[PDB]
Design a protein around this ligand. Structure first.
Ligand SMILES: *[C@@H]1O[C@H](CO)[C@@H](O[C@@H]2O[C@H](CO)[C@@H](O[C@@H]3O[C@H](CO[C@H]4O[C@H](CO)[C@@H](O)[C@H](O[C@H]5O[C@H](CO)[C@@H](O)[C@H](O)[C@@H]5O)[C@@H]4O)[C@@H](O)[C@H](O[C@H]4O[C@H](CO)[C@@H](O)[C@H](O)[C@@H]4O)[C@@H]3O)[C@H](O)[C@H]2NC(C)=O)[C@H](O)[C@H]1NC(C)=O
Lengths: 128, 105, 120, 120, 120
């Protein structure tokens, strides 16, 4: 189960630095990576990066190496295996090329070869 | 940098095969290949991870394969709802998905 | 007394966790006496299952009872690389009594096949 | 507590049978306490013979002591297809202490032959 | 209760030695009760080390931990044909806790190599 509701579809103008939220429910927020992948209108789907809500470790794409700031606040425990965390992501020198729908997805597993694979996607926030 | 099939399609009862190949920096005999059923703009779906492993809940019709230079995605026994787009990932254990050009059906 | 180090990896995945004398009947003496009896009772309670399943002296013993998929439909990547031993128990706690009886008889039928094998 | 199902075939042939907390020293509490101690004592009493004979975790263990015909002169059809485990004990109850000492040393001499074998 | 015959060769070399019911809380009853509990406690205290080292039901079990010469520098003729088990303990009593942890993990790593071996 689980649902990763995203922020609002707010659109600004070039030069801005919009922040996109992604709060989770129904699963252990610290047990899986969070992942952000956009779908540019004039490009193929582009993977941006994942961060570990537990270790606090980040790994992003070269096209977003010094352009994206993504963070996560700690989880609010609900039961032994349910938490309510949140994931935020910003962009630096945003232009009209970054126009498109943005997604947040959680990791596939918590060990092995495909640990961080974006398995459970959110809802999507439409940008400029 | 990761090319796929231009386009393919079939009828209810047959099967397809969406290719996914590329240069030595993205494919294949040293990276894992995953497959997503991704309708454009909407919430996608993980259908295959690391070459041929099926995600939980996936019907046993989505069979995967990977030779030393290309990975295939067979969608045997087609359904009306299978007609969307498909992209393939290129990833290891400590990296990121390198998506492909996509292939509609 | 023994160790709670097993418990170190209670939140880790199943693949990571697995990888003086004189008696005086004072209020503390009776308290400390039952703790001594309650230890050897709970210890042998587990240790007799390991013996009757043909697994005494073993930490990980493979059996011969096939995995009936009705007990769990999850993948080997969904179990050993996702679930923790604490939550995996809650999912399978219905069939634990049904599984403990199969391992009990798989050992019993293995014993009679050995008494026929070593007779040659 | 364990099982009296073993006892189901007490009249069957030998071949068929083989094939809350808090302590209170009330009159019932002292009664129920010794029952708990008398169980683990009688249990390990048998379980240490199985261990010292090299048969821990086993239900049927074959040994290396030959059957001295002076213990019983009956045939294998007269034993496993006729006598019951209850009456077979009465016939052999004289040599049970004489047999338990041979199985005890057959295991002991097997241990020193293994420490010489695995040294190669 | 068991035997003090092991103790027969307490001065021999290491190579020679190795080769009714009802409870009543009277002063004697409480005395005889703890003796019964103190026996099963000290018995399982040793018997759980043998089990966790993969040596249950064994008198002499060979391990896989090499002999670190810093524990003792003596020769095999200086040990098994000279020292007695009573005095050999005093020489090595410092590393006994350091050795008991290696035999404990040599068994643990042997168990995971078997679960990978029997999977073929
Ligand atoms: C508590 O619960 C959490 C979450 O459930 C557990 O954290 C997860 O552990 C698993 C398994 O250990 C992790 O999966 C691994 O992911 C790594 C990816 O990290 C690598 O890449 C980073 C970016 O490139 C890099 O910085 C890392 O390098 C070091 O730096 C960080 C800094 O914090 C440090 O924390 C790291 O530990 C590194 O020392 C790192 O190299 C990946 O490498 C792993 O793949 C290998 O291992 C698997 C076997 O496990 C094998 O199959 C692969 O083929 C490959 O050999 C593996 O995928 C996961 O990322 C963790 N985080 C999550 C899921 O969010 C935590 O372990 C639990 N702790 C306890 C005590 O229970």
């Amino acid at each position: 189960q689980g649902q990763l509701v995203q922020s609002g579809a707010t659109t600004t103008k070039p030069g801005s630095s919009v922040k996109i939220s992604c709060k989770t429910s129904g699963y252990r927020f610290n047990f899986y990576h969070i992942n952000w992948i956009r779908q540019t209108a004039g490009r193929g789907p582009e993977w941006m990066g994942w961060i570990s809500p537990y270790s606090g470790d980040k790994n992003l794409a070269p096209a977003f190496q010094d352009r994206v700031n993504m963070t996560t606040d700690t989880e609010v425990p609900v039961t032994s295996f349910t938490s309510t965390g949140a994931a935020y992501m910003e962009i630096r020198n945003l232009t009209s090329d970054d126009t498109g729908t943005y997604f947040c997805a959680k990791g596939l597993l918590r060990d092995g070869s495909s640990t961080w694979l974006p398995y459970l996607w959110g809802q999507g926030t439409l940008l400029t | 940098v990761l090319t796929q099939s231009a386009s393919v399609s079939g009828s209810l009862g047959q099967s397809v095969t969406i290719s996914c190949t590329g240069p030595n920096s993205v494919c294949c005999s040293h990276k894992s290949i995953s497959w997503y059923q991704w309708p454009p703009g909407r919430a996608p779906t993980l259908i295959i991870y690391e070459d041929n492993e099926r995600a939980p809940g996936i019907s046993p019709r989505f069979s995967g394969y990977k030779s030393y230079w290309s990975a295939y995605l067979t969608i045997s026994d087609l359904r009306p709802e299978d007609e969307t787009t498909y992209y393939c990932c290129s990833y290891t254990h400590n990296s990121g998905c390198v998506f492909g050009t996509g292939t509609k059906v | 007394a023994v160790f709670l180090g097993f418990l170190g990896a209670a939140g880790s995945t199943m693949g990571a966790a697995s990888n003086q004398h004189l008696l005086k009947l004072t209020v503390w003496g009776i308290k400390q006496l039952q703790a001594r009896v309650l230890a050897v009772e709970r210890y042998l309670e587990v240790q007799q299952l390991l013996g009757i399943w043909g697994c005494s002296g073993k930490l990980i013993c493979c059996t011969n009872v096939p995995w009936n998929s009705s007990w769990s439909n999850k993948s080997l990547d969904e179990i050993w690389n996702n679930m923790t031993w604490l939550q995996w128990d809650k999912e399978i706690n219905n069939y634990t009594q049904l599984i403990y009886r199969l391992i009990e008889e798989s050992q019993f039928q293995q014993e009679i096949n050995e008494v026929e094998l070593l007779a040659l």
